[PDB]
C-alpha cells in the first residue's frame, strides 16, 4: 500500500530531482550586511520563503504523502532547519570559504562575527561544505541525503513504512554509486561517509535552533508566524 516502494531506483532519482525547490534570491539594493539586524533580517526573510517551497517539496518525496497529516507536520517540524542547512551547504559547495545563502548573498567568516555567537555555526557549515566538495558529492546523492533527513530526523519521536522507504533510498544511493563505477568496498564506505555527515548536520541544526530561540527572546529581529511555529515545535 505505497507507490513509493514500487518505484525503480531511477524512478526514485527522477522523482527527487524533479521535486527540487528553486534557488531563491535575497533582497536587493544592498549594503554588505554588517548589522546583527540586517543580516538576520535578510536570512529570516530568505528562510521564510524557502519554507514554503520545502513544504511542497516534501509532499513530492515518495512515501511522504502516504503518512497521516500529523506525521507530516512532525517530520517537517523536526527536520526543517536541517534541510535548509544541507541545502545551504550544497549551494556553497563551489564557493570555498563562503556561504551561498542566495546567488546575490555570499557570506564569509567575518560577517558571521556580526552576530554574537554566530561564527561557530558558520565554521561548521563551511567545514561541511568543504567536506562535500572533497567527496565530490553529486546532485543525485544530495537529493537522496535530503530526503533521508526528512524521513529520519523525527522518526523516533512518534512505523515500518518510513523505515522501508528509508531502506529503499539506501538502495538508491548504492545504485547511484555502482552506476558511477565504484567497487563494492568503495560503495559501502562512501555510504557510511555520507550518512555520518547527517550526524553533524543534526548537530548544526540543534545549535542553530538555540540561536534562533535566542533571537526570538531578543525580539530585535521580527520572526514570521510560520517560523515562530516551526521554532516553538522544538522547545
Amino acid at each position: 500500500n505505497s507507490l513509493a516502494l514500487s518505484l525503480t531506483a531511477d524512478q526514485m532519482v527522477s522523482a527527487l530531482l524533479d521535486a527540487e525547490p528553486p534557488i531563491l534570491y535575497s533582497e536587493y539594493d544592498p549594503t554588505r550586511p554588517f548589522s546583527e539586524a540586517s543580516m538576520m533580517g535578510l536570512l529570516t526573510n530568505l528562510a521564510d520563503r524557502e519554507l514554503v517551497h520545502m513544504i511542497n517539496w516534501a509532499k513530492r518525496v515518495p512515501g511522504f504523502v502516504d503518512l497521516t497529516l500529523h506525521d507530516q507536520v512532525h517530520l517537517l517540524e523536526c527536520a526543517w532547519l536541517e534541510i535548509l542547512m544541507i541545502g545551504l551547504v550544497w549551494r556553497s559547495m563551489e564557493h570555498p570559504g563562503k556561504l551561498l545563502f542566495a546567488p546575490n548573498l555570499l557570506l564569509d567568516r567575518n560577517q558571521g562575527k556580526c552576530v554574537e555567537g554566530m561564527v561557530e555555526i558558520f565554521d561548521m557549515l563551511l567545514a561541511t561544505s568543504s567536506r562535500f566538495r572533497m567527496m565530490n558529492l553529486q546532485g543525485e546523492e544530495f537529493v537522496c541525503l535530503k530526503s533521508i533527513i526528512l524521513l529520519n530526523s523525527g522518526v523516533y519521536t512518534f512505523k515500518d513504512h518510513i523505515h522501508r522507504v528509508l531502506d529503499k533510498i539506501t538502495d538508491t544511493l548504492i545504485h547511484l554509486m555502482a552506476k558511477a563505477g565504484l567497487t563494492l568496498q568503495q560503495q559501502h564506505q562512501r555510504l557510511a561517509q555520507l550518512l555520518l555527515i547527517l550526524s553533524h548536520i543534526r548537530h548544526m541544526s540543534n545549535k542553530g535552533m538555540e540561536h534562533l530561540y535566542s533571537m526570538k527572546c531578543k525580539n530585535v529581529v521580527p520572526l514570521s508566524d510560520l517560523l515562530l511555529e516551526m521554532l516553538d515545535a522544538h522547545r
Partner: peptide
C-alpha cells in the same frame, strides 16, 4: 497551525 494549512494545499 499554519503548517497544517500549507500541507493540505
Amino acid at each position: 497551525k499554519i503548517l497544517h494549512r500549507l500541507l493540505q494545499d
